[model samples]
Target: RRRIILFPVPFQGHINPMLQLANVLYSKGFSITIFHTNFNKPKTSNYPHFTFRFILDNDPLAGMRIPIINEHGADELRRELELLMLASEEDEEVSCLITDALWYFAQSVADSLNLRRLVLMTSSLFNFHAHVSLPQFDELGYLDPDDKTRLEEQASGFPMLKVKDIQFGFSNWKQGKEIFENITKQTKASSGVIWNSFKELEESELETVIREIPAPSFLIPLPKHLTASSSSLLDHDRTVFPWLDQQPSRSVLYVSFGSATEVDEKDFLEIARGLVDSKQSFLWVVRPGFVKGSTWVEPLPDGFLGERGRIVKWVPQQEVLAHGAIGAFWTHSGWNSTLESVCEGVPMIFSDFGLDQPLNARYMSDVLKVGVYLENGWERGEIANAIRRVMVDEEGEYIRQNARVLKQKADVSLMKGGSSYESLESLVSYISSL
Candidate 1:
């Protein structure tokens, strides 16, 4: 079997997509070894077919955000990552590194070792396009530099993306411009690229990325596991689907913020309040480590019980989306959640908080119009408003109808011989041929 090494920036938002790709790659017969840092807390798997290595717990390369701490710098991150390739036991050299864009250190390590380095940017191509184009702000200045302005001029790559689409660390106008310059320059050093989006959705920009960026860019949509056999989850709970069976058709709203982002105590309280007040049924997957603080679960207002709402530690999200009860999804717009929503044909209300999530929210709401974006964070009122907009309101009906159409389109792309599946096969063959 062909073996490959994978390292992710130690955040679930980035790590989860890379993990999914590893799953797909493993299915394709790639011998996989995933590198873990202190924050990851590696989960043991019975699959001896794959390997997981735990390394320097203090390595700052992970860029994990703890409470009341500042984000780490790239130079510091790079210095720590240098140790990843040293002092290891595997007989085989790392054939290629399928690494996160945030883990730019992999580019330097792969280059020094003369190994193939594939950059797996976890966000949309549009987000990468925005980041890559950031430096040109002066030449293609949103406004010419002659008009000196302190307000960070809005930055974008796609004609549809605007100032509102931008999120996370690089919020400053000058910082945003500089960061993109650094990223694309670093991106040019990679051997090739693998993005999470399939070509069917963003055909124009994918073409632009391939032609303009000085590397081979490949698109691989996640395999639709909901359509795959249920044999994979032998040890896991299978009863969540029975809960969905009891709900009304196209009536239940499924809510979950992908694992990494912090769930605010205030936001959680308000969301629970709203869901109860709306009198609409919902299923929320609230992960154990979701909140941060001494008052975590205690602060949440009680009274949402039984069929009115069921809170699970985790649920088979893709399976639930495929169920008839799921009409709309209340998500943070994680790429996996977004793609799953597309496959299920369920409209979404994105309560995006950090990382690439805001960008995903933008794509779904503006470009696809199959969802709504909840702005200015989650107030109790905003949560209620967004939920009603997607589930009960007339506009919600229109969005749901549109979502159904998008689901059909996604099915065509993910079905056997469809564009997405073809892309996946091509990627496997391309890598294997090497």
Candidate 2:
């Protein structure tokens, strides 16, 4: 049997897709092995078929300190990766290495071992293009920290992207540039690239990547059936399901900002006021420490908690989005959340901060016309209005129509002989030949 080694970046968004990919490849008759960090270890019981190896790094808080892990810890990761490769040296059945794009150094290790290396971008192709095009933007003076006109200027290479829509537009310019450079380097070095998105969703962007990027590309949709089993680092509050059961169909708006991002107290209070004013039934996932510098948040205004909405640390997100009661999603616009909302035919209101979120929001609201973009940052009245526009107003019908259409396309693309199915079939054949 041929064996494949996979390495995920050890964050919730990264881990979930890689595991889902592993499950898909396993069903395709490949023996799978995963190399993970001790920080945020995978629950091995969930996958009885795949072999697991944990690399011990110095910091137990490696997941929290992303730049530190990427910069200071690269050598340690390389050592552990070398050890794994050496251990598998005698096993001629080992086929290739698949790695997260963040681990740029892994390509060199694969080269040393004379193994085929494939890189996974667990983000939209639009976002990946933004990463690759950063240097070009810099040379064109678009990424200038001192340039007041930067935000209004349209990005030259990306579709429908203003300068502000670029990833890390608001903060950390230097460090973000370095990170993107490294990611682009590894992405170009890999033998092949796997994107965790369906072609029907981003046909133009995917085509652009295939045409311009050096590496061969493949698109594999995350199957809806696999949504039932998620590899979350946080425990899910299953009680949200029962509450959702009682709500009216397409009445409740679901809100979550993913695990890593946190809003300041001012923005948090604005969101709270917005939810209250909107008066829509809602389910919110306010993970612990979601607010910066606080272990406890004060209770919301009186009478707002009972039937209006419920707050939990986390919920089974895909299940909640799939539920009939979920009318709309207010999200941080993470790629995973965006794709899940697309899969379920749920329209969105985007409240994005950093990373690829701004770009994803642009795609959803401007390109796809399936969401309302919250341009003003966390104003109470504006937030309420955005929610109402998607959840209650007649203006939202087009958004709803677009969402359902995209959802149908996403569903059909995953079936036999569909775009995603054919892409995966091609990917499997490529790997087998390697």
Candidate 3:
């Protein structure tokens, strides 16, 4: 068996897909080794077949946030990564290195070791194209921080992506630009690129990426079983699962903004009020740090919890999404959550916060027609209305039906001889030959 090593960006979203890919490759007769950082460490029990290698990094940001600290610690990361490779050289006889595209230093290390490098992109192809073309936007004055109109400008190659869909480093434009440029540069230099989405979901953009970019591209379908299998860094509250079992079929709306983004008190109250106003049963995940600077869980409006909602720190999200009681999902539109929601055939009520969310929301509403976007920020009335539209109105029937249909299509793709399975087989063959 060939030995292959993988590196993920260490955040929950980035870590899951890379692990799923490892599971996929391991099943195909490859010896898998995962190089991970100390921060946001993943559970090794989930994949006993794979070996785990941990690098100590005291900086909390090293694992949690990428672009903000990547350049700062690149040298240290490279040194540790090189040491790992050298130490395992003889026993493992590594054939390739698969890395998160966001970790720019890995490509250079792969080059130095003369190993084939496959960059795993956890986000959408549309977002990748925008990053590749960011310089053009900046050169043509489209990325002006001062001009609101320029933010709406559209770029070629990405059909539905707008100027605002372009993602940058959080809170710092210069740092964000540098990070985007670095990722694009390293991506272009890779021997191959791996995408988490299947062809049916992003055919146009995938074709555009392959035609325009020099590296060969591969699409890996996310198997339904693996959707919830990725080990989470946070503890899961299983109590909600039994609670969901009691609710009426398709009667509950599952709500969460993921682990990274926090909601302000203003928006938090709005969401609480909206769930109450809608009179819909909901299971919401409100982590301890959901509100800035508050250590303990803040008090909700009086009688809010008793009315119709259940809140917890976290739950098995994919389990909740797959529950019979879940009618719709209120999400922050993170790529991983988006994919999981889609697989479960749950229509989405998207309140996109930042990064690839806007792009994912656009595709959910426009291309997939399985979701509705909440406009004008998060207000109680709009939130309630969007919920009612998806769960109670005739207008949402089409969206609901489309989501169910896509779920079947998604299932079909994972079957043997289907697009995703065939692609996987092809990838295995290619790797074996190498």
Candidate 4:
């Protein structure tokens, strides 16, 4: 038997896909072990088969990550990895080490141990393409913070590229630029890069990644294999399912801005107002401290949300998206959220809070024609308009149909002879040989 060791920091969205990837390999008969921290250890009782290697670090993720994690302890973790390298109970050869791309340091660890290292990119390939072309986007003045103009209006949502360069556009430009460059360089150096997206969704970016990086790349839609099971650090509001059960089929708007995007009261109120104005049945997930100043929905007026809206701390998002009553998703356009929505065949009302999000919105609305892009920032009128356009109005039929078609394509790609199936087969074979 061959063993594969995986490491992932328990950020909001990172660990889920890594674990999903782990399960897929385990199903393929590979012995699996995971390196995790006590800070955010997943409930081990859930995975009786997975071997857990728990380690700790102080000075945690204080400054920017990726570089920070790499610089802080490239060699500090060296012996621990070596210990795990040989400390197996079974007759399994450690095939390789796989880590989330942000953990660039692991590449060095693998090299020091003369072991293969592969990267699991939680973000999409198209994002990598747009971001890698940052120099071009920078020259175009797209990164200028002052020129915070709408991307949709300029070039009318075309002639655009991906995530990193736009991240350079943010005030934290220098940090992310260096981080992205270093990660990309290290990624190319790794044995292979596995993307959590299917060819059908990002066919346009294949040549870009294939040519730019000198390694085999695989496209495996992790969500298709499993829900980022227990990915949420907090407990989910499963009771929302009963409420969803009562709603008219294909009528509810699901809104979750993801865990990162902070909300100011003004915009938060605007989001509240927008949901009300949309007049669609809605289930909104507002994480504690999602509002910047206030703790949770304390800022929300007492009982201000009408009967049409139900606010909860969180929901099983993947399950909720798959629900028949979920007509449309109002999303931060976070890659994970967007991908899950696509998998569930739900149309989206696109909203972005930066960092590969707007890039995703741009890709989906312009290239795929999947939903309405709320180009303008949070406003009651525009929010309601986009919501209605995707969930209610007759004009949105095109976007709705496109979403359904893409969902079917995602399914097809997982079957034998499909692009994703071949990619997965290639990945498994490559790992088996290593």
The weakest ten consecutive residues by lDDT in model 4 span: 161-170
Q: What is candidate 4's local distance difference test score?
A: 0.81
Top TM-score hit: 4
TM-score, cand. 1: 0.80
Query: How many steric clashes does model 1 contain?
Result: 0
Model 2 residue 107 lDDT?
A: 73
**Candidate 4 lDDT over residue span 56-124, tens digit each:** 464312324445567876776677777876676567778888998888778887898888899999888
Q: Which wins on TM-score, candidate 2 or candidate 4?
A: 4
lDDT of 2 by residue, 65-147 (tens): 56565656556656765666567646437788898888777776677767778988888888877776777877766577675
* Model 4 lDDT, residue 415, Cα: 86
lDDT of 1 by residue, 1-434 (tens): 46678776556555556677777888877778776565654344544566776544555222434211213333333443354445334654345667776655556656665667788877777777666555554455432434443333345443565444453423445334544554566677777788776666677677668766687777766535333222122132457688778887977899878765666666667677877776678988776656656333566645555657777666667778888988789988887778777866788888666445666787778777889887566667777778888889886777887788876766677678877777778877777777
Decoy 2 TM-score against native: 0.93
Considering lDDT, which of the candidate structures 1 and 4 is the better prediction for this target? 4
- Clash pairs detected, candidate 3: 169-176
TM-score, candidate number 4: 0.93
> For model 3, how does the per-residue alpha-carbon lDDT over 123-192 read when each residue is reduced to its tens digit?
8786786676677777755466565534446655545755555532122354557767778888889888
State each model's CA lDDT, in order. 0.66, 0.80, 0.76, 0.81
Judging by TM-score, tell me the better candidate of 1 and 4.
4
List the candidate 1 regions with Cα displacement exceeding 4 Å: 58-62, 65-94, 136-159, 167-169, 172-180, 223-239, 289-295, 304-306, 379-382
Worst lDDT 10-window in candidate 1 = 227-236
Q: How many residue pairs clash in model 4?
A: 1
